[PDB]
Ligand binder design. Structure first.
Ligand SMILES: Nc1ccc(-c2ccc(F)cc2)cc1NC(=O)[C@@H]1C[C@H]2CC[C@@H](C1)O2
Ligand SMILES: [Ca+2]
Ligand SMILES: [Ca+2]
Ligand SMILES: [Zn+2]
Length: 369
């Protein structure tokens, strides 16, 4: 048990990257998160590092040479010359070309891989990179605002020193890029909780359980609109406890996508910051090397709240509900509190549904050796 060493990765340039007018991804939210947690005094309890810019050598440990070469070359001024490749690599529309795109990929990736190295060297208990968690990016394809899969790269780093790595994903969307990368291996177990049914990315059915050596090492909990703290807490600790018992990982990667929070611009879940952060508390009790990553989140005031509170949880530091003054204080009106209320939206996940899906996942976890 006990309190644990936390290393936290942040680059002050991250907030200046801009996806374009009306695009819901705001890298500014990482700066808001940073500034809020600094104003709570949480810098006093952890080591703050600036990530290196991850190289093409680092990125091509997973991604194709042609895809990384394209990301290094593509700019707003030369887009007409790469019309074929833009379509091939799924760049230009939802994943736009913007100024400094490659540098943005290098920063988000750098934090996750640096955190993994720190964990491998046994120089920290927890590593935190809120700029990471880009779980949709594929080997040779951008997807869902993600270009470079920092998570896959960080897990490959952990696999140098860890026989078994557990990946847990509480983003509202299915962690499809991470699942796909490790679908045929027992050395990574991927566990995703997500909205499923007529929803992006369209994968992560209950019946998707892995293949070959990876059969029974992919776990998917499909959910409906409006899941709440009670319903999520119903199943999270039981599932993760059973996974820990059967799989026995030596390192953990937790993707903490904040688009599962109540009031998210794109999401349809109803979790509070406390309900979301209960997942961090559950994972942290197992006392394994832990990489905590960001993810989605489009109501940026709540993203800042969520990841500030989850940093406090990682540190075992109680922080007051009254928000301290900060550079983005006006974003947190009209209440200026840390914690959020759930909406009155209907929870389409019945208690019977939650128990039934849990029981079917328990059947699959019995098939581990
Ligand atoms: N899930 C996720 C996780 C991380 C990042 C992400 C991407 C780049 C970053 F620098 C940091 C985080 C994005 C998503 N993308 C979504 O949530 C969108 C997927 C599609 C398109 C609109 C809607 C929402 O459906
Ligand atoms: Ca998920
Ligand atoms: Ca697997
Ligand atoms: Zn998401």
């Amino acid at each position: 048990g006990g309190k644990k060493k936390v290393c936290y990765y942040y680059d002050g340039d991250i907030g200046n990257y801009y996806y374009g007018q009306g695009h819901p991804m705001k890298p500014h939210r990482i700066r808001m998160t940073h500034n809020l947690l600094l104003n709570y005094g949480l810098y006093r309890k952890m080591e703050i590092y600036r990530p290196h810019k991850a190289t093409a050598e680092e990125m091509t440990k997973y991604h194709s040479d042609e895809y990384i070469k394209f990301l290094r070359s593509i700019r707003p001024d030369n887009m007409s010359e790469y019309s074929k490749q833009m379509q091939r690599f799924n760049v230009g529309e939802d994943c736009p070309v913007f100024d400094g795109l490659f540098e943005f990929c290098q920063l988000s990736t750098g934090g996750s891989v640096a955190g993994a190295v720190k964990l491998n060297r046994q120089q920290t208990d927890m590593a935190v990179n809120w700029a990471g968690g880009l779980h949709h990016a594929k080997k040779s394809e951008a997807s869902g605002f993600c270009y470079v899969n920092d998570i896959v790269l960080a897990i490959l780093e952990l696999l140098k020193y860890h026989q078994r790595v557990l990946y847990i994903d509480i983003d509202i969307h299915h962690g499809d890029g991470v699942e796909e990368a490790f679908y045929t291996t027992d050395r990574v177990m991927t566990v995703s909780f997500h909205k499923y049914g007529e929803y992006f990315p369209g994968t992560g059915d209950l019946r998707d359980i892995g293949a070959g050596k990876g059969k029974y090492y992919a776990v998917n909990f499909p959910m409906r609109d409006g899941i709440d703290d009670e319903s999520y807490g119903q199943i999270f600790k039981p599932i993760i406890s059973k996974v820990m018992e059967m799989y026995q990982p030596s390192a953990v990667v937790l993707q903490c996508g904040a688009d599962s929070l109540s009031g998210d611009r794109l999401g349809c879940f109803n979790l509070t910051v406390k309900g979301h952060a209960k997942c961090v508390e559950v994972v942290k009790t197992f006392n394994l090397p832990l990489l905590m990553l960001g993810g989605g989140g489009y109501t940026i005031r709540n993203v800042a709240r969520c990841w500030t509170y989850e940093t406090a949880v990682a540190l075992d530091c109680e922080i007051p509900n009254e928000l301290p003054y900060n550079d983005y204080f006006e974003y947190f009106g009209p209440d200026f509190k840390l914690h959020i209320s759930p909406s009155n939206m209907t929870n389409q996940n019945t208690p019977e549904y939650m128990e039934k899906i849990k029981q079917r996942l328990f059947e699959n976890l019995r098939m581990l050796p």
